[PDB]
Each structure stands twice: as structure tokens, then as C-alpha cells.
Amino acid sequence: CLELPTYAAACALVNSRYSCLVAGPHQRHIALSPRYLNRKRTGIREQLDAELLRYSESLLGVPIAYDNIKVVGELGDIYDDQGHIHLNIEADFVIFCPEPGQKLMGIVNKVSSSHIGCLVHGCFNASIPKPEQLSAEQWQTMEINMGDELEFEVFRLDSDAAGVFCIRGKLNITSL
Template identity: 30%
Template sequence: MPKRRRVNQEKGNDVAGEDDKIVPSPVIQVPFQEQRVLFKLALLPDAMGNLEESIHEKLHDMLMKYNQDVGGILLTLSQVRFPPSRRFASVMGDLPHLHVRVEATSLVFTPEPGMSLTGVVIKVTSTHVALLVYDLFNAAIAREDMPEAYAFDNDREAWVGTGGKEVLGLGEEVAFRVALVHEAAGLIALDGSLREEGGEPRAPVAGLPEGDGGGKGGEGGREVEEEERKGVAGREGKKRDTRGTAEEGARVKKRKEVTGKAEAKAHKKGKGKRLKGEKGLV
């Protein structure tokens, strides 16, 4: 993996050009909280054989997953104990589950929109930059959330500013603002932004964005990209033509089979009539 380099997002630094209008580096916030959490667990009857082990297994399955009650990802659990109550378990109705309440201290990852975080660039494309935050969580900065002065350069595999120096490339550590937090199936993903909060996003551009620096992202790059798009469209059209030809051939074959069967049936029927007529003449 390339050596990590921190991207200093201040105007007039050694990374960006003098003309680049970049959002100053935000104050990085700590998205971790230590909470004392009350868990309500539903255990099957066989858990009574070793209740302590069953509780720890149930809690272990919750780690590294989003928990709505705490509003974040459970990273660690410690100091697990029953709450101070005479009744720590109950059975509801005719259900077989044993409902147990336990307390634990948990370290929770709680990112929120507007929070400033850092991530390491793991992928750069013309539409977005993918980041790994704390070596665990995925984040992405879309093209619309890049500074206006930046453009994608295929040769450098990076987003560069008007000064022509690399700004966002593989392995670099980038400070960004959390725009959105997505959660699905216990996992989270972050949408980030390098623009000022409340600022207008970049105007969408049809096709790939224009590059900078005269590489594939420049004028010559646009011609190559146009040829690549034409090539992809041609291959897709050829696939559709081939598929359509095969389907048409199958339909023609089926029609021939049906026609052949009908003609054979009609021929057999006509022959029978002729034989019957001949017998009548005899």
C-alpha cells in the first residue's frame, strides 16, 4: 500500500496551488463514546445449561454492528453483569425464550452529519473517492462534493487542483466532513464532503468530468474516453444483435417444424381420402 500522506487543505500550501480554493482543515472530532448499556436478550431454554456463556455469545454477535438503541456501532463490551434487581429473567406468555437483562460498558462508534473525520484513500475514480476510516469503516466523497477547482486526472489516478499537483491520490490521509450516514443490515457507510457546509454542490456534467494537466483527463483523455464509450456501446449492440439473431433463428425453426407437421398431417389425410375413393370405385 502506498505510504500515507496527509492532505493539508489550506490555501497556498505545498500540496495545492495558489489558485485552489480549498476548505481549511477542520478540527477533527472524536466519534467514539463509552456508554453503559442495558441489553435485553432472548435466550432459548438450552441456554440454562451454561447461562453465562450463552449471554457472552449473544453479546459477541452484536459487536461490529449498528445498534439503534445506542445510535452507533458496538466496538467493545466489558464489565458485563446483571442489573441490581431480584428478577433478572422472565418468560412471556407461552413463548419458550428466556428474556434476560444484562448491563455492559461499551465503546461505540457514533458518526454524525457535520462531524469532521479522517480517512485513507483506497480508491480513486472520476465519480468519487473511496476512503477507509479508522481502518474499519467505508466512506465516499462524490464528485459533486469535491472543491470546484479540482478535476480528475487519469494519468495520475488522482483529483488535482488548478496548480497541477496531486491532491487526492491513493494512500493519502484526507480530512473530510460527514454529510450522511447510511445504515443497512447492521453495517454503516459514510458520505463525505470537502466543500463548505451549506455550500452548493458542483454542477452535474454529462459523461465523465473534464480532467486537468493534459493527461487522459485532459483533451486527449476526453477523446480516449469517448472512444471507450463508443466501444462499449458497440459491444453491447453486437451482443443484442447476436442475441436477436439467435432468437429469430429459433422462431424460424419452430415455425418450420409446425409447418412441416401440418403439411405431413394434411398429406396423410389427403392420402386416406384418395384410398377411400379408390376402394369405392373398386
């Protein structure tokens, strides 16, 4: 339901046997607003929350949680004519780095003729195409784990139009 997860000691360790929630400390670059000269932690947390659920090729994945916000150096680099102060951050992330053809699990929204949207970790509205041209009788007579929970494969990943790393992967039953 797009509910914001806490860091929750690495998101209650949702780096399970299948879903790749690898955790590693990283450095990011932050253009802090000048209204946050005091309350720098608030502005850093706000810009990191703006960074969440968006794919970063530098982080090689999609961040879902951050902790240990540490500032590198006590000097903030005000550049020439701009107002934003640029400070270099150090934080420990929990990121989501998927692959083509690998295993994931999801909690479904709908199962239509050709749209199955399964929530991966409660944030990622990952859509699944239901028919894979093997039969049209597999639409009825469920047999595709049509429950609250579902496990699936990914063939391609393309970001959504507004603030979401979308995942477009077919169901890929192991038999048939």
C-alpha cells in the same frame, strides 16, 4: 479488512481529537436461546457480537466494543409460550455517534472518479464522493490528501443494506 477489534482497554482509546468514540455503561435486552442455559456468557457475547456495527437509536450511536458484561438480577423471565429466556444485561460500551458536518479520519480502499471508500477505525467502510463540482481537474493532480490516510467530512449518514452502518460524506477540502 473487517477485522474484529477487541475491547483493548476502550479500543486502545481511539476516542481521538476528532473521531467520537464515547464510552458509557448501558443496559441492553437479551433474548437468550435455550441452548445457552449453561454457557450464558457465550450466548450473551454472541448476541452482542450480532449487535455490533449496527446503529441503535436507544444507544444513540453504533457500538464498536463492549466489556463488563453484568447480569441484572438472578431470575430469567421466561414468557408465556416462547422458548427464549429474557434477561436484562448491563455492559460498558464504546460506541460511535457521528454527526452531520463533523470531522473524521479514514484509511482508503480506492480513489475512483466518484468513489472513495475510507476505513474509519478499520471497520466502517465509509464512502466519499470525489467530485464536488468545483473542477474536474482535481481528479488528477491529487491535492486532496491522496495517501493511505485521509481526513474528511460527513453530510449524511445512511446504513448499508447488510449489517454495516455506512457513512456517505463528501471530502470537503477546507480551501477550495
